[PDB]
Amino acid sequence: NTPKDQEIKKLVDQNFKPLLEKYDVPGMAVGVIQNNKKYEMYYGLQSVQDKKAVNSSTIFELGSVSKLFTATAGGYAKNKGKISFDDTPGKYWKELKNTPIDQVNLLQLATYTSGNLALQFPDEVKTDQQVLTFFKDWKPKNSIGEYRQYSNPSIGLFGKVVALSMNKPFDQVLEKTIFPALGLKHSYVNVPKTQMQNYAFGYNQENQPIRVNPGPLGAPAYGVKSTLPDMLSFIHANLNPQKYPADIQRAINETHQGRYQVNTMYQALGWEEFSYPATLQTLLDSNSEQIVMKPNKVTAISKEPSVKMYHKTGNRFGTYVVFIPKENIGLVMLTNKRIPNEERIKAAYAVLNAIKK
DSSP states (O other): OOHHHHHHHHHHHHHTTHHHHHTTOSEEEEEEEETTEEEEEEEEEEETTTTEEOOTTOBEEOGGGHHHHHHHHHHHHHHTTSOOTTOOGGGTSGGGTTSGGGGSOHHHHHTTOSSSOOSSOOTTOOSHHHHHHHHHHOOOOSOTTTEEOOOHHHHHHHHHHHHHHTTSOHHHIIIIIIHHHTTOSSOBSSOOGGGGGGBOOEEOTTSOEEOOOOOTTOHHHHOOEEOHHHHHHHHHHHHOGGGSOHHHHHHHHHHTSOOEEETTEEEOSSSEEEESSOOHHHHHHHTSHHHHHSOEEOBOOSSOOSSEEEEEEOOOOOEEEEEEGGGTEEEEEEESBOOOHHHHHHHHHHHHHHSOO
């Protein structure tokens, strides 16, 4: 292969490969896209029990990186006039009309500022019916819009609303509208029978294979599955939205707009945004316990940074994606085992700082 193929292989071998042994991770796929050329590295096993090696067809669970697709769907719906971000959920989910949650707008749900939604639903909320009841019974706490608390229920409700506004279930929004618009071929909410042989098992902390369908409203928060080639295409779309038809181009661009600031992090739709270059500490701070687990006061912005970069981490979901528009480069890491977020961020930082222009 080319000098570039070899260079990138060396950097990934040096920075990502050692994580497999360190965290006993069965399988990993790492991809780089630079100047619209894709570079794919595969390690280890898609399935331990089957001795099936990870390859370009291997479908991984994206975990929280799923939220980037929910964000894109929301951007799509907004730019087709199907929703306004100033709307409230009861406009679409009619059973929520004239309940307190109908005082929170869609942008606030998408960006985690309702003021009273935690990382997960309560343990007892297990079914679709129960999720609706939960939202009807909800009451505010922190001033709406003022505090960010990273939240699966919050973006789940956003996703449900987006689906309602497009008159189809969320899985169909992604599988029939958004994935095809992005040119993705093996990305799914529900992996079909024909692709099960390619679907990596996830592995818990005891090295046992786990496979569940998402909980109620779970799909918009953590329910997407994809391959490394598809994820590199998704990064390409984020790096070059102008090359795509207007409806999806406008959707992608919508996800890049910072909506508020928490210290050095700007919250966009799905994506976290930073002034570029971001220090390693800035990137690490974005995924600290303080930021991920606790409420933090937001500050309004009048402007985004002049030069930007974006990332998202995907807890058995070892996923990470990052891109830098100015350098026309991005990186994707997929694994089927938990790896601390800080290790993902550090490895990607080393690679992106070292790759030749």
